[PDB]
Design a protein around this motif. Structure first.
Motif, PDB file in Angstrom:
ATOM      1  N   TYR A  91      30.225  50.025  28.212  1.00  0.00           N
ATOM      2  CA  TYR A  91      30.651  50.638  26.889  1.00  0.00           C
ATOM      3  C   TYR A  91      32.228  50.693  26.900  1.00  0.00           C
ATOM      4  CZ  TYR A  91      26.079  53.327  27.591  1.00  0.00           C
ATOM      5  OH  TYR A  91      24.753  53.910  27.551  1.00  0.00           O
ATOM      6  N   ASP A  92      32.661  51.529  26.216  1.00  0.00           N
ATOM      7  CA  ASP A  92      34.098  51.094  25.235  1.00  0.00           C
ATOM      8  C   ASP A  92      35.257  51.678  26.795  1.00  0.00           C
ATOM      9  OD1 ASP A  92      33.590  50.276  23.488  1.00  0.00           O
ATOM     10  OD2 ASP A  92      33.648  52.734  22.329  1.00  0.00           O
ATOM     11  N   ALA A  93      34.256  51.442  28.038  1.00  0.00           N
ATOM     12  CA  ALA A  93      35.649  52.032  29.160  1.00  0.00           C
ATOM     13  C   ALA A  93      35.498  50.477  30.425  1.00  0.00           C
ATOM     14  CB  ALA A  93      35.224  52.625  29.773  1.00  0.00           C
ATOM     15  N   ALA A  94      36.638  49.906  29.831  1.00  0.00           N
ATOM     16  CA  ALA A  94      36.895  48.814  30.366  1.00  0.00           C
ATOM     17  C   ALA A  94      36.606  48.322  32.005  1.00  0.00           C
ATOM     18  CB  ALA A  94      37.770  47.552  30.216  1.00  0.00           C
ATOM     19  N   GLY A  95      36.655  47.922  32.791  1.00  0.00           N
ATOM     20  CA  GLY A  95      36.897  47.474  34.470  1.00  0.00           C
ATOM     21  C   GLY A  95      38.620  48.070  34.844  1.00  0.00           C
TER      22      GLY A  95
ATOM     23  N   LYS B 162      42.216  46.510  35.690  1.00  0.00           N
ATOM     24  CA  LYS B 162      42.898  45.121  35.774  1.00  0.00           C
ATOM     25  C   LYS B 162      43.598  45.207  37.014  1.00  0.00           C
ATOM     26  N   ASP B 163      42.799  43.792  37.323  1.00  0.00           N
ATOM     27  CA  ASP B 163      43.612  43.253  39.525  1.00  0.00           C
ATOM     28  C   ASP B 163      43.427  44.432  40.871  1.00  0.00           C
ATOM     29  OD1 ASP B 163      44.510  41.984  37.358  1.00  0.00           O
ATOM     30  OD2 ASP B 163      46.689  42.689  37.899  1.00  0.00           O
ATOM     31  N   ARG B 164      41.764  45.036  39.834  1.00  0.00           N
ATOM     32  CA  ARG B 164      41.273  45.556  41.232  1.00  0.00           C
ATOM     33  C   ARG B 164      40.888  44.004  42.177  1.00  0.00           C
ATOM     34  NH1 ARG B 164      41.978  50.723  44.014  1.00  0.00           N
ATOM     35  NH2 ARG B 164      39.904  50.710  44.463  1.00  0.00           N
ATOM     36  N   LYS B 165      41.031  44.510  43.808  1.00  0.00           N
ATOM     37  CA  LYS B 165      40.514  43.841  44.743  1.00  0.00           C
ATOM     38  C   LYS B 165      39.462  44.704  45.439  1.00  0.00           C
ATOM     39  CE  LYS B 165      42.873  40.332  42.257  1.00  0.00           C
ATOM     40  NZ  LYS B 165      41.555  38.719  42.052  1.00  0.00           N
ATOM     41  N   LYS B 166      40.517  45.352  46.174  1.00  0.00           N
ATOM     42  CA  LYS B 166      39.289  46.542  46.600  1.00  0.00           C
ATOM     43  C   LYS B 166      38.950  47.431  46.228  1.00  0.00           C
ATOM     44  CE  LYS B 166      42.286  47.014  51.147  1.00  0.00           C
ATOM     45  NZ  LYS B 166      42.557  44.944  51.223  1.00  0.00           N
ATOM     46  N   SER B 167      37.419  47.246  46.422  1.00  0.00           N
ATOM     47  CA  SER B 167      35.881  48.584  46.101  1.00  0.00           C
ATOM     48  C   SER B 167      36.159  48.156  44.639  1.00  0.00           C
ATOM     49  CB  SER B 167      36.673  49.922  46.341  1.00  0.00           C
ATOM     50  OG  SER B 167      36.944  50.143  48.248  1.00  0.00           O
ATOM     51  N   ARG B 168      35.394  47.432  44.657  1.00  0.00           N
ATOM     52  CA  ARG B 168      35.467  46.938  42.273  1.00  0.00           C
ATOM     53  C   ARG B 168      33.992  47.579  42.205  1.00  0.00           C
ATOM     54  NH1 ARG B 168      35.917  42.352  44.719  1.00  0.00           N
ATOM     55  NH2 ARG B 168      33.712  41.726  43.597  1.00  0.00           N
ATOM     56  N   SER B 169      33.194  48.040  42.995  1.00  0.00           N
ATOM     57  CA  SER B 169      32.082  48.342  42.349  1.00  0.00           C
ATOM     58  C   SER B 169      32.041  50.047  42.021  1.00  0.00           C
ATOM     59  CB  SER B 169      30.730  48.719  43.535  1.00  0.00           C
ATOM     60  OG  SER B 169      31.593  49.689  43.629  1.00  0.00           O
ATOM     61  N   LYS B 170      32.844  50.746  43.021  1.00  0.00           N
ATOM     62  CA  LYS B 170      33.315  52.114  42.106  1.00  0.00           C
ATOM     63  C   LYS B 170      34.201  52.317  40.970  1.00  0.00           C
ATOM     64  CE  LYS B 170      32.787  53.470  46.666  1.00  0.00           C
ATOM     65  NZ  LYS B 170      32.848  54.027  48.158  1.00  0.00           N
ATOM     66  N   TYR B 171      35.188  50.627  40.910  1.00  0.00           N
ATOM     67  CA  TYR B 171      35.771  50.557  39.517  1.00  0.00           C
ATOM     68  C   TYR B 171      35.828  50.132  38.285  1.00  0.00           C
ATOM     69  CZ  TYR B 171      38.366  54.076  42.561  1.00  0.00           C
ATOM     70  OH  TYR B 171      39.263  54.782  43.669  1.00  0.00           O
ATOM     71  N   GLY B 172      33.976  49.405  38.391  1.00  0.00           N
ATOM     72  CA  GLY B 172      33.627  48.609  37.412  1.00  0.00           C
ATOM     73  C   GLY B 172      34.356  47.315  36.982  1.00  0.00           C
ATOM     74  N   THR B 173      34.879  46.577  38.395  1.00  0.00           N
ATOM     75  CA  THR B 173      35.488  45.268  37.730  1.00  0.00           C
ATOM     76  C   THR B 173      35.123  44.125  38.066  1.00  0.00           C
ATOM     77  OG1 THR B 173      37.589  46.505  38.075  1.00  0.00           O
ATOM     78  CG2 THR B 173      37.199  43.914  38.343  1.00  0.00           C
ATOM     79  N   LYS B 174      34.397  42.466  37.660  1.00  0.00           N
ATOM     80  CA  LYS B 174      34.229  41.346  37.996  1.00  0.00           C
ATOM     81  C   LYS B 174      34.659  41.265  38.856  1.00  0.00           C
ATOM     82  CE  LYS B 174      30.683  41.451  34.496  1.00  0.00           C
ATOM     83  NZ  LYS B 174      30.610  40.664  33.429  1.00  0.00           N
ATOM     84  N   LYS B 175      34.025  40.604  39.879  1.00  0.00           N
ATOM     85  CA  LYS B 175      34.530  39.790  41.217  1.00  0.00           C
ATOM     86  C   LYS B 175      35.305  38.478  40.638  1.00  0.00           C
ATOM     87  CE  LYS B 175      34.183  37.818  45.493  1.00  0.00           C
ATOM     88  NZ  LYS B 175      34.879  38.509  45.955  1.00  0.00           N
ATOM     89  N   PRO B 176      36.986  38.257  40.700  1.00  0.00           N
ATOM     90  CA  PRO B 176      37.162  37.319  40.363  1.00  0.00           C
ATOM     91  C   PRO B 176      37.493  35.906  40.783  1.00  0.00           C
ATOM     92  CG  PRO B 176      39.063  39.086  41.124  1.00  0.00           C
ATOM     93  CD  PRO B 176      37.716  38.927  41.177  1.00  0.00           C
ATOM     94  N   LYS B 177      37.906  34.597  40.414  1.00  0.00           N
ATOM     95  CA  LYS B 177      37.390  33.550  41.430  1.00  0.00           C
ATOM     96  C   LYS B 177      38.827  32.303  41.778  1.00  0.00           C
TER      97      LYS B 177
END
Ligand code: SF4
Ligand SMILES: [Mg+2]
Ligand SMILES: [Mg+2]
Ligand SMILES: [Mg+2]
Ligand SMILES: [Mg+2]
Ligand SMILES: [Mg+2]
Ligand SMILES: [Mg+2]
Ligand SMILES: [Mg+2]
Ligand SMILES: [Mg+2]
Ligand SMILES: [Mg+2]
Ligand SMILES: [Mg+2]
Ligand SMILES: [Mg+2]
Ligand SMILES: [Mg+2]
Ligand SMILES: [Mg+2]
Ligand SMILES: [Mg+2]
Ligand SMILES: [Mg+2]
Ligand SMILES: [Mg+2]
Ligand SMILES: [Mg+2]
Ligand SMILES: [Mg+2]
Ligand SMILES: [Mg+2]
Ligand SMILES: [Mg+2]
Ligand SMILES: [Mg+2]
Ligand SMILES: [Mg+2]
Ligand SMILES: [Mg+2]
Ligand SMILES: [Mg+2]
Ligand SMILES: [Mg+2]
Ligand SMILES: [Mg+2]
Ligand SMILES: [Mg+2]
Ligand SMILES: [Mg+2]
Ligand SMILES: [Mg+2]
Ligand SMILES: [Mg+2]
Ligand SMILES: [Mg+2]
Ligand SMILES: [Mg+2]
Ligand SMILES: [Mg+2]
Ligand SMILES: [Mg+2]
Ligand SMILES: [Mg+2]
Ligand SMILES: [Mg+2]
Ligand SMILES: [Mg+2]
Ligand SMILES: [Mg+2]
Ligand SMILES: [Mg+2]
Ligand SMILES: [Mg+2]
Ligand SMILES: [Mg+2]
Ligand SMILES: [Mg+2]
Ligand SMILES: [Mg+2]
Ligand SMILES: [Mg+2]
Ligand SMILES: [Mg+2]
Ligand SMILES: [Mg+2]
Ligand SMILES: [Mg+2]
Ligand SMILES: [Mg+2]
Ligand SMILES: [Mg+2]
Ligand SMILES: [Mg+2]
Ligand SMILES: [Mg+2]
Ligand SMILES: [Mg+2]
Ligand SMILES: [Mg+2]
Ligand SMILES: [Mg+2]
Ligand SMILES: [Mg+2]
Ligand SMILES: [Mg+2]
Ligand SMILES: [Mg+2]
Ligand SMILES: [Mg+2]
Ligand SMILES: [Mg+2]
Ligand SMILES: [Mg+2]
Ligand SMILES: [Mg+2]
Ligand SMILES: [Mg+2]
Ligand SMILES: [Mg+2]
Ligand SMILES: [Mg+2]
Ligand SMILES: [Mg+2]
Ligand SMILES: [Mg+2]
Ligand SMILES: [Mg+2]
Ligand SMILES: [Mg+2]
Ligand SMILES: [Mg+2]
Ligand SMILES: [Mg+2]
Ligand SMILES: [Mg+2]
Ligand SMILES: [Mg+2]
Ligand SMILES: [Mg+2]
Ligand SMILES: [Mg+2]
Ligand SMILES: [Mg+2]
Ligand SMILES: [Mg+2]
Ligand SMILES: [Mg+2]
Ligand SMILES: [Mg+2]
Ligand SMILES: [Mg+2]
Ligand SMILES: [Mg+2]
Ligand SMILES: [Mg+2]
Ligand SMILES: [Mg+2]
Ligand SMILES: [Mg+2]
Ligand SMILES: [Mg+2]
Ligand SMILES: [Mg+2]
Ligand SMILES: [Mg+2]
Ligand SMILES: [Mg+2]
Ligand SMILES: [Mg+2]
Ligand SMILES: [Mg+2]
Ligand SMILES: [Mg+2]
Ligand SMILES: [Mg+2]
Ligand SMILES: [Mg+2]
Ligand SMILES: [Mg+2]
Ligand SMILES: [Mg+2]
Ligand SMILES: [Mg+2]
Ligand SMILES: [Mg+2]
Ligand SMILES: [Mg+2]
Ligand SMILES: [Mg+2]
Ligand SMILES: [Mg+2]
Ligand SMILES: [Mg+2]
Ligand SMILES: [Mg+2]
Ligand SMILES: [Mg+2]
Ligand SMILES: [Mg+2]
Ligand SMILES: [Mg+2]
Ligand SMILES: [Mg+2]
Ligand SMILES: [Mg+2]
Ligand SMILES: [Mg+2]
Ligand SMILES: [Mg+2]
Ligand SMILES: [Mg+2]
Ligand SMILES: [Mg+2]
Ligand SMILES: [Mg+2]
Ligand SMILES: [Mg+2]
Lengths: 137, 208, 96, 122, 99, 82
Positions: free
Chosen positions: D101-105, D107-122
């Motif tokens: 929703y209005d809660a974005a992931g 910024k700049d997570r690399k370790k454990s992204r699922s628990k912090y709702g961050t898409k995988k960087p390329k």
RNA sequence: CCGAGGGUAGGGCCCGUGACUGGGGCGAAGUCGUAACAAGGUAGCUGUACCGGAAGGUGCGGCUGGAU
RNA sequence: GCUAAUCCCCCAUGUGGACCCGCCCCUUGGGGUGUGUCCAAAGGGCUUUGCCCGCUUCCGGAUGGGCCCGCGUCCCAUCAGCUAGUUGGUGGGGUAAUGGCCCACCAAGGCGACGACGGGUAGCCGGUCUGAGAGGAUGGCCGGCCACAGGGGCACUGAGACACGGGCCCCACUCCUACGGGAGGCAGCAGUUAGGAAUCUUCCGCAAUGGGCGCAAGCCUGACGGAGCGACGCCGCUUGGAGGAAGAAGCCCUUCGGGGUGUAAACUCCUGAACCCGGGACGAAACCCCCGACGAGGGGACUGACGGUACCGGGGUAAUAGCGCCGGCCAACUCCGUGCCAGCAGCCGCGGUAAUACGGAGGGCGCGAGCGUUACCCGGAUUCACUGGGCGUAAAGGGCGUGUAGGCGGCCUGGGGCGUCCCAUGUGAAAGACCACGGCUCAACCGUGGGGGAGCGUGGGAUACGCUCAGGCUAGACGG
């Protein structure tokens, strides 16, 4: 007294912890049948119908192990364990197929059945169940 | 699917040579024969006493990493052996052995189980006639494991059969060379294989 | 927006009609018989009771009265009538 | 107790008390943020933990934790929550799910992204 | 078969009907111990022959009224007021269990 | 009425009927009175049919009615051989 | 005749909420004293009663789970 | 206003059946019988002195149901008293039938600490999940039963309904119109919308199985047979395989000597998921026709939604990897950065300038088209303890007596045989589960077979213990 049978088993258990040569229990035609099984299965040296102050008793001659080495020269027991299963508070009935093997075979369950007082072995032999009196080893 | 990765790091962690390559395994260019210490930055650091758990993890991972098999299928077999009559260790080991990809590697049709899978997977193998491309097929007693004739006339099978002239194959297995076809005789007794695994410890892993 | 179930409804209304018509006549006659049977009039009592009895079983032939209902009704008709006639009497016909 | 005492009164099956009442049986519940602010934790810790007051679709309004470094939450922000206390923040019994929703992931997570709702960087 | 129970008549205050208290034993499903439970049946007595205290047998039967699904089978014993007392006193005690 | 028919078991694209006696008003794979044989239309096994011809004649005697495609599996099983 | 229900009247149980108010929990880096733990500086604890900013004090009887 | 019948009614016949009275057997209203009384019917089609489908009345079978009984079925006693059709009777009404189901009258009863009444929650079971077992939790899918069809009430027709896509009436809502008036009931298959953390195609087919109607051809079938969608779950499979440096670059670490990633890559050979071409089902042999006798039997043919899919054969490309974790529990360690900040967190606890505990990196561990999280269930919990716990100081003996109900009870001998134990026997549906084999190339899934048990009904048997009745004793108890 409320449980005549248990009292006997307890009189025995208590007497063996101080290695009494014998001990006396108030007599009964049913306590005897049990005591019979207790002697034949080799838990006791035997018993005999005595009298105390004119009153019928059963004297039970107790059997123990050999003198032992070490700090505690007290011999082993022949009856390590004896205790009521069925009780006045709760009557324990088992069919033949559900009769428990006491100590993997090394001990017996005395039982009262419609074909006399039998052991677990004998119950399966005769093919009958009944009230589970006690277990001894 | 299966592990599908760098395979020498396995042996170095296990502290044992797991003959997972075929040819290179015996050469002195083996990983173990050059570095008998664990993969990674801290491989030379002096190891501390492995926990009771650590020991049983390794032995299970060992037996599993040998067969190149997934932990699920590993678990499921163990369970099947856990329900089935007799010594659980024996039945488990036998069941792991009765896998087609393993039988193929055992009768020497391939150099590695890893290679033995692709042979099964690519239809290059057959059983009692019919073609099978399933690395998991449960080999029974009496199963005639053959190379498909349409795959008989191929280099890779030849080179590998050219080594199977006099190599003896376990008391539970027979073989007809040249004809490229063998047979599964019976389930391997624990005696039949001397795998670097105390399989009792594997049972104990799963009893947690 | 319609079926032949509408047809099945139509039939019911006519059978209800024929049903009510027979059952009323029964009750009308049965009581009529019972009526006379008290003030007997023993002949007239039994005379009517037959016409009621008839109409009972004739309704029983159809979907009007079930077999056991007609039997049930008749058993109660006769019993009441005869005992009505046991006071005074005497049964002038049959019957019986 | 005597065997008889057991026949009469029996034993007492003790129930479990939910630790996440506002969830009302559900795995997750949608809400909207009323207040978004910082709260100081109890001893022996010391910080400014990020916390949101969310009013749920269960009719409830509970205080929720905001995990991760930085956030895009504000008043009227629609938010999804999950269970789990934050021990050191008394009164906080729920975590806000990042990446919903209005809660974005973060910024700049690399370790454990699922628990912090961050898409995988390329 | 038609179920037959033995019980004491604890009330004869109805006409052509008596209350027959039947008891039963069974081991408690979890706790083993043999326990007693009883249940009152209203029984049909067409002749009103049975008295208070009579130990009797009743057979399950076709419905007679509401709550009446048993007819009295036969007289088993006469004059067990000692049992009616056991029943009656418990009822009397209930007036001391209120508030 | 009481009938003798096929209740499908097996699975998707894997037919496997049980010949059985049950009420016509039953749902087809519903509770039946008694099973009296089985049948595999895909013929994947040596005996893809078998029928207790003793029993299958009992119900038939008392007024059971077979389906058409069951009469086949009953004739072939030699229930109709006189 | 009974009858879905509608209407009038009076009761019962539950839930929500209410100016204000009683204490309770946590927060803690405030204020006042120091009641308890040593004979804690009047041995403590106790039921009850009265009293005092507050811990508490005192009377009466009780316990030792009280030092010497 | 006309007209037919398998529509409706009347007389007749009475095999028989229905009713009252009597009587014999039986024993609740079961069977037979005599007198009186009452009751039937429908025709159609072809090959036409004969069949076929029907129709009537009665008896039996089979199947599906109604009703009744015993035992079993959750929380609160801070719900302890409940009850006027209430409990029973008499007589009727009503039904297929018993019944206060209903009415009138008569009696004054019925139920309740063995938990009535009241409140709360729940459709129940076969089974399912867990657990060593005992037990706990649960009832989605599949099978059995119940209940319901917008919210309520009612009956009609009927073998059967008080009827989801039948009827009437009241309510709420919505809609349509020409504003005069009327209509509807997706908890059927799809689909829309609202609610929500969230749950599908307005698909295809009657070819298969089952169902309704018909002599039959055949017609209907959102049951069903399949397809579509969604890693929701389980299972099978893939992203390759062999060779290949005392070891490239890159990046990390370093005592600056070197160590790591790593045979990993590069590169060499080998195979050939995908894709292209060819052929192409099992599922479908019945009904039907032919002969036979429309029967037994033999012979003939039609039809495939899935689908040109699976699969078989030929050609043929090296072809997706991610996620969590690495302080202890608990498997996996180093550097930089921050400096009680930022943050982590299941518990213990981490961070205040040397952090394996935060963030990033390298390296490592675990799994793998999945990995993790949240929620709930059981387990660990012998932490409600039947199996299998406790109460001097840890939580826990009532302030003490007296006693109601209840629970428990000495030695001997008999009778009964209720508990208890044994045997026989019926039931314990199917699916699931367990064991064996078999079918899909394996598995998942599915088929065939096998083993059973509890528990209850029944008959027979036993008598030690518990029980009960009976007769004795004096050790308990009480009295002199
Ligand atoms: S070569 Fe074969 S054996 Fe030597 S390490 Fe690599 S894999 Fe293990
Ligand atoms: Mg026990
Ligand atoms: Mg998988
Ligand atoms: Mg090897
Ligand atoms: Mg085993
Ligand atoms: Mg060897
Ligand atoms: Mg386990
Ligand atoms: Mg019609
Ligand atoms: Mg009139
Ligand atoms: Mg009718
Ligand atoms: Mg009729
Ligand atoms: Mg909102
Ligand atoms: Mg801190
Ligand atoms: Mg949690
Ligand atoms: Mg991660
Ligand atoms: Mg009556
Ligand atoms: Mg058909
Ligand atoms: Mg009213
Ligand atoms: Mg009203
Ligand atoms: Mg109204
Ligand atoms: Mg307040
Ligand atoms: Mg306040
Ligand atoms: Mg003081
Ligand atoms: Mg002080
Ligand atoms: Mg002091
Ligand atoms: Mg005081
Ligand atoms: Mg004051
Ligand atoms: Mg002051
Ligand atoms: Mg003072
Ligand atoms: Mg004092
Ligand atoms: Mg002291
Ligand atoms: Mg005419
Ligand atoms: Mg006539
Ligand atoms: Mg016809
Ligand atoms: Mg009556
Ligand atoms: Mg009533
Ligand atoms: Mg009345
Ligand atoms: Mg009166
Ligand atoms: Mg009761
Ligand atoms: Mg209670
Ligand atoms: Mg409610
Ligand atoms: Mg429930
Ligand atoms: Mg409900
Ligand atoms: Mg346990
Ligand atoms: Mg559910
Ligand atoms: Mg169901
Ligand atoms: Mg309703
Ligand atoms: Mg309705
Ligand atoms: Mg409605
Ligand atoms: Mg609706
Ligand atoms: Mg009809
Ligand atoms: Mg009816
Ligand atoms: Mg309706
Ligand atoms: Mg209904
Ligand atoms: Mg509808
Ligand atoms: Mg309908
Ligand atoms: Mg108009
Ligand atoms: Mg109108
Ligand atoms: Mg519509
Ligand atoms: Mg729908
Ligand atoms: Mg939808
Ligand atoms: Mg929506
Ligand atoms: Mg929405
Ligand atoms: Mg579907
Ligand atoms: Mg069809
Ligand atoms: Mg037909
Ligand atoms: Mg249609
Ligand atoms: Mg359709
Ligand atoms: Mg899938
Ligand atoms: Mg080197
Ligand atoms: Mg190197
Ligand atoms: Mg390098
Ligand atoms: Mg290097
Ligand atoms: Mg390689
Ligand atoms: Mg076919
Ligand atoms: Mg056809
Ligand atoms: Mg033929
Ligand atoms: Mg093709
Ligand atoms: Mg090909
Ligand atoms: Mg090629
Ligand atoms: Mg490559
Ligand atoms: Mg993990
Ligand atoms: Mg540390
Ligand atoms: Mg570790
Ligand atoms: Mg440094
Ligand atoms: Mg900073
Ligand atoms: Mg983390
Ligand atoms: Mg430091
Ligand atoms: Mg640092
Ligand atoms: Mg770290
Ligand atoms: Mg951590
Ligand atoms: Mg998952
Ligand atoms: Mg738990
Ligand atoms: Mg437990
Ligand atoms: Mg216990
Ligand atoms: Mg304890
Ligand atoms: Mg005690
Ligand atoms: Mg005391
Ligand atoms: Mg008191
Ligand atoms: Mg007493
Ligand atoms: Mg007694
Ligand atoms: Mg006694
Ligand atoms: Mg006796
Ligand atoms: Mg008995
Ligand atoms: Mg079964
Ligand atoms: Mg097979
Ligand atoms: Mg089976
Ligand atoms: Mg079993
Ligand atoms: Mg049995
Ligand atoms: Mg006796
Ligand atoms: Mg006596
Ligand atoms: Mg004395
Ligand atoms: Mg004296």
């Amino acid at each position: 007294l409320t449980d005549p049978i248990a009292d006997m088993l307890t009189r025995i258990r208590n007497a063996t912890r101080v290695y009494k040569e014998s001990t006396d229990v108030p007599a009964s035609r049913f306590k005897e049948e049990i005591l019979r099984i207790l002697a034949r299965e080799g838990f006791i040296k035997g018993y005999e119908r005595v009298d105390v102050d004119g009153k019928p008793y059963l004297r039970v001659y107790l059997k123990y192990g050999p003198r032992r080495q070490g700090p505690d020269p007290r011999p082993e027991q022949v009856i390590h364990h004896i205790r009521r299963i069925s009780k006045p508070g709760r009557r324990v009935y088992v069919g033949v197929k559900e009769i428990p093997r006491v100590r993997r075979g090394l001990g017996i369950a005395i039982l009262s059945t419609s074909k006399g007082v039998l052991t677990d072995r004998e119950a399966r032999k005769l093919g009958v169940g009944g009230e589970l009196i006690c277990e001894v080893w | 699917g299966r592990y599908i990765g760098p395979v020498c790091r396995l042996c170095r962690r296990e502290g044992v040579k797991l003959y997972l390559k075929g040819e290179r395994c015996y050469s002195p260019k083996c990983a173990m024969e050059r570095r008998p210490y664990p993969p990674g930055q801290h491989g030379q650091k002096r190891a501390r006493r492995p926990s009771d758990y650590a020991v049983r993890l390794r032995e299970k991972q060992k037996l599993r990493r040998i067969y190149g098999i997934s932990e699920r299928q590993f678990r499921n077999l163990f369970e099947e052996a856990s329900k089935k009559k007799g010594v659980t260790g024996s039945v488990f080991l036998g069941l792991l052995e009765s896998r087609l990809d393993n039988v193929v590697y055992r009768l020497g049709f391939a150099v590695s189980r890893r290679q033995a899978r692709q042979l099964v997977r690519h239809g290059h193998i057959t059983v009692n006639g019919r073609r099978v491309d399933l690395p998991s097929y449960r080999v029974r007693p009496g199963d005639e494991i053959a190379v498909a004739e349409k795959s008989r006339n191929l280099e890779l099978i030849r080179q590998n059969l050219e080594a199977m002239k006099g190599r003896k194959v376990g008391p539970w297995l027979s073989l007809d060379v040249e004809g490229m076809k063998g047979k599964f005789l019976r389930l391997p007794d624990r005696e039949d294989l001397a795998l670097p695994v105390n399989e009792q410890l594997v049972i104990e892993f799963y009893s947690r | 927006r319609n079926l032949s179930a509408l047809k099945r409804h139509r039939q019911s209304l006519k059978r209800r009609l024929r049903n009510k018509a027979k059952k009323s006549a029964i009750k009308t006659l049965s009581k009529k018989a019972i009526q006379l049977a008290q003030e007997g009039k023993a002949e007239e009592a039994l005379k009517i009771m037959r016409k009621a009895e008839s109409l009972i079983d004739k309704a029983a032939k159809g979907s009007t009265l079930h077999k056991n209902a007609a039997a049930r009704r008749k058993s109660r008709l006769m019993r009441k009538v005869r005992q009505l006639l046991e006071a005074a009497g005497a049964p002038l016909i049959g019957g019986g | 107790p005597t065997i008889n005492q057991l026949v009469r009164k029996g034993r007492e099956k003790v129930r479990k008390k939910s630790k996440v009442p506002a969830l009302k049986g559900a795995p997750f519940r949608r809400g909207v943020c009323t207040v978004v602010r910082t709260v100081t934790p109890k001893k022996p810790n010391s910080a400014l933990r990020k916390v949101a007051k969310v009013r749920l679709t269960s009719g409830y309004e509970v205080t929720a934790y905001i995990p991760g470094e930085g956030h895009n939450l504000q008043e009227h922000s629609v938010v999804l929550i999950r269970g789990g206390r934050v021990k050191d923040l008394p009164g906080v019994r729920y975590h806000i799910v990042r990446g919903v929703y209005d809660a974005a992931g973060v910024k700049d997570r690399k370790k454990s992204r699922s628990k912090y709702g961050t898409k995988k960087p390329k | 078969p038609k179920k037959v129970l033995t019980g004491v008549v604890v009330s004869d205050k109805m006409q052509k009907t008596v209350t027959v208290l039947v008891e039963r034993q069974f081991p408690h499903p979890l706790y083993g111990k043999v326990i007693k439970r009883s249940k009152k049946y209203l029984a049909h007595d067409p002749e009103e022959k049975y008295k208070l205290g009579d130990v009797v047998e009743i057979i399950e039967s076709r419905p007679i009224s509401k709550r009446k699904r048993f007819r009295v089978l036969r007289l088993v014993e006469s004059g067990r007021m000692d049992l009616v007392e056991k029943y009656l006193i418990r009822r009397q005690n209930y007036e001391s269990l209120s508030k | 009425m009481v009938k003798i028919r096929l209740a499908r078991f097996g699975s998707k694209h894997n037919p496997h009927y049980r010949i059985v006696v049950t009420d016509a008003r039953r749902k087809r794979d519903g509770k039946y009175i008694e099973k009296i044989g089985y049948y595999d239309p895909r013929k994947t096994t040596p005996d893809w049919l078998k029928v207790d011809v003793e029993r299958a004649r009992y119900w038939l005697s008392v007024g059971a009615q077979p389906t058409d495609t069951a009469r086949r599996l009953l004739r072939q099983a030699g229930v109709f051989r006189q």
